[PDB]
């Protein structure tokens, strides 16, 4: 469960970066 | 001022989701440090039961 925390973590973290470089591109 | 505070209103509106995601990343990696401390605690102690 820690293994699939610190997934959830890096998921959450690459998807957020994503959306807020894609929101400040345009 | 008046000036000076619209842009300093309009700066804090944009940091709305950073601060945020910055919030919930704090929680996420104070909690994984809490259960690696917890595994690295039960790790050890089996490992001189064995």
Do not use: G
């Not at chain 1, 820690?2 to 929101?23: F, G, I, P």
């Not at chain 2, 700066?11 to 690295?40: I, P, T, V, W």
């Amino acid at each position: 469960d820690l293994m699939r925390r610190q997934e959830e973590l890096r998921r959450m973290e690459e998807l957020h970066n994503q959306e807020v470089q894609k929101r400040k591109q345009l | 001022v008046e000036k000076n505070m619209k842009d300093a209103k309009d700066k804090l509106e944009s940091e709305m989701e950073d601060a945020y995601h910055e919030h919930q990343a704090n929680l996420l990696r104070q909690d994984l440090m809490r259960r690696q401390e917890e595994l690295r605690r039960m790790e050890e102690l089996h490992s001189q039961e064995m």
